[model samples]
Target: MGHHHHHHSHMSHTQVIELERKFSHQKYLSAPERAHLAKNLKLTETQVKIWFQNRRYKTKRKQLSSELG
Candidate 1:
């Protein structure tokens, strides 16, 4: 949701870069993976969850754009 703007904009470049890599690789993260990612990225579980949600939407929109274009 809109929650992304609150914290994501504050994240460092590396954090967003890492997020891009990980997020594309898996649809679901295991519990330990979630913990490790949250701790390492300094993001809350809710933020991670929303990140995935928003990422899927972002992916889908781009996919649609490509298809339409």
Candidate 2:
């Protein structure tokens, strides 16, 4: 059995900072907003969507843990 090679990459610091600032302002994005952000950040719509999805999950998990503690 063999496994294919995987290349994992991350967005640049500038991109990450921009995304975080946007996330602070709004937890969700509409189609238009996503498109605008993607263009501005030179990223794909899907990448922006997935980033928001992951950010939301991380935020929710932190909240839940805080509540439990």
Candidate 3:
């Protein structure tokens, strides 16, 4: 027996690289910036917003760990 199907699409390598480049430049994006990036990357604005949130959290955690050590 199988469970209900889950739909998801992983970002391509090129997309990930582009996101990383932008993230390095600025951790936040304005509405227009998000719109442009989403269009260029072929991703939804919601996805871009979520990715930035997650990336920022990840960076914060890493800094905390370094400070604690």
Name the candidate that leads on lDDT: 2
Comparing 1 and 3 by lDDT, which wins?
3
lDDT tens string, model 3, 1-69?
843433234779889889999999988998998989999998877778877777776664544364221
Name model 2 segments beyond 4 Å from true.
1-9, 61-69
Q: Which pairs, if any, clash in model 1? A: none
- Residues 1-69, model 1: lDDT tens digits: 465454544567788787778887886676777777878888877667667666666553544364221
lDDT of each: 0.69, 0.79, 0.77
Best by TM-score, which number?
Answer: 2
Once fitted onto the true fold, the runs of candidate 3 whose alpha carbons sit more than 4 angstroms away are 1-9, 61-69
In model 1, the Cα lDDT at residue 69 comes to 14
Clashes of 2: 0
- As a TM-score, model 2 comes out at 0.73
Error of 3 at 13 (Å): 1.7
Global CA lDDT of candidate 3, please? 0.77
- List, residue by residue over 1-69, the lDDT tens digit for candidate 2: 642432223899988999899999998999999999989998777788888877776663544364221
Candidate 1 stretches greater than 4 Å from native: 1-9, 61-69
